[model samples]
Target: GDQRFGDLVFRQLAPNVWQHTSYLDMPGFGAVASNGLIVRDGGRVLVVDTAWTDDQTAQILNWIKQEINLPVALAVVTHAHQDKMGGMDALHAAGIATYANALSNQLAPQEGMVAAQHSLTFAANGWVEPATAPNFGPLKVFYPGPGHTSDNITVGIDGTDIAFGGCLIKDSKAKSLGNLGDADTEHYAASARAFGAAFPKASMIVMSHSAPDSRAAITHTARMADKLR
Candidate 1:
């Protein structure tokens, strides 16, 4: 089982895998629900994404610190959206190594417009500038394609049998590829396909905006992308 964060909530999906849910608020843009995972393996705690804002990040971190004093070995940004990556500063300042796609690092600077928009609604929801080159302890960052966003990256956990997909995987009941305006439908499908093909043996798929499930979830996203095309 997972814990609760005000309106947001969380649930443990697997051994060393947990899911955090964003409170239902805005649809489409906010989508009301956001998903995140906490992975503990090989004596380290890896937080999948920062969630909506710095305050949220701090709350989660504080919770973790009280529960376990282990430092955040790594922080993975599934995408470049404010809701997911806006809490980078809080995590980074706490001495956690951050990882994102190379493309996200390059375009992160240009996200001020997106961040500014969120500021109007969630004024405190802001991300600290990330380092030019994010360093992950020993995990590998994979870029399947420009789906969702040009720099969308998936984080693969070593030896833990867990994989974190940002917005790539929708809820189990999702009917379409979703929010393709910013993503290249073709490449998006290709990325999902690539991930499915490569991680055939993965035990779980943890997403940034929804619940975590088995590798079937990855294939589900690919199937949804195919249907869209």
Candidate 2:
């Protein structure tokens, strides 16, 4: 019943996509878990976000090497949160090319984590593709204005109908927005709308703090966004 793989847990979502869950101890929230994606294409792999710390991230790198056996060519974090980019140091040390939205990179260091090496530009709406490598191209990273955080974005893999909704796309079970310290509350609803429209075909969305779900999570999250407005 357990999906545990060493210190991390793994769930193979699609034939080519996997979700990795790692935990972090929040000062008041107890031990909370965050999720990330590991996508396989041909002879290469793409990692979306890092675990909560350098040590956890290093374990993931090792897991990919021993279990997946594919060279991880790129790593992208959905935003600047610690759960999203906490392992930037581990990733860079391993020489794994890391990227984040230009704004996410700008916000990372102020939060105490290293910034990703490369920047992927994003318009207020619509999506942007990360740097390409041969057949590694299913992912579409979208910035839907601002929601959970000003720089929050969703990463969706085209063919699989799967999107990593980061911290912005609330899990279906959530009754309220998770965090709003830097949230753009007034624009959250608009961002939620744009996030859903960007990937109409998404059947399974990997959320940051909960189990993956059908696109129903989009509607569920939008309702919460509306409440904020």
Candidate 3:
């Protein structure tokens, strides 16, 4: 059953995947909503990206445990930005293991943000390193180089062909490359291309702040990146 709390809502995208949207009142940006992915595999679940605030994230945790009836086994911070990992402490308090790339871990604290408790360095063994394609249960996290942020990553379900592009990809209506404050414009297009090449069978592409769509989002983002360059 889908549930809503405050400005957050959990909409099930599939049998094993769900989309959690949390609205935020940014100082200059006004009202905004951020999206995250919640994946369930048997009795264990994995949350990808936290909400804008600890309280909002806590609500999500509660919903997952209470409504979904699954214990959160792990969480993956898709990047260092606040919208992606601001609820690190909240997850930690709930005893949920959180993991992030080495770059995100290093840059997050620099941005006055709390880094994930666990680290997964790209190219490192036993983790989701670029070219290594590691798996957490049935889900896989892939680092396709820099795009929206230097440490942004995509999470994919093994048989669902669903990929959470984090902030790396954009929706079809996106005019420009969404946010550029932490973006790598020079390599943005190439990164998106590499991601598409890596997961050619991906049928659904979910973005961090847009409606879930097909591979058109990847191509749209790449085209936007090219225009920006």
C-alpha lDDT score of every prediction, in listed order = 0.64, 0.84, 0.83
Tens-digit lDDT track for model 3 on 29-100?
787788998898887888899998898999899788776888898898889988888898999999988888
Q: Model 1: clashing residue pairs? A: 35-208, 35-209
Query: Lowest-lDDT window of 10 residues in candidate 1?
Result: 116-125
Give the candidate order by descending lDDT: 2, 3, 1
**Candidate 2 lDDT over residue span 1-229, tens digit each:** 3378777898888888888889988889798899999999778899999999999999988888887898899898989988989999999999898888888889888988789888888653566644422233787888888899988878889788798788988778787888799899999988887888888888887899999987778888888788887
Query: Which candidate do you rate higher for lDDT, 1 or 2?
Result: 2
What is the Å distance of residue 164 in model 3 from its true position?
0.7
RMSD of each: 7.4, 1.8, 2.5
TM-score of 1: 0.78
lDDT of 3: 0.83
Give a tens-digit lDDT track for model 1, residues 5-107. 5655767665666666654346566545677777765577877777677767787787667665677777767667776777778876677767665455555
Best by lDDT: 2
Candidate 2: stretches off by over 4 Å: 129-136
Question: Which pairs clash (backbone N, Cα, C closer than 3 Å) in model 2?
Answer: none
Better of 1 and 3 by TM-score: 3
What TM-score would every model get versus the actual structure?
0.78, 0.94, 0.92
- Distance (Å) between predicted and true CA of 115, model 2? 0.5
Of the pair 2 and 3, which is ahead by lDDT?
A: 2
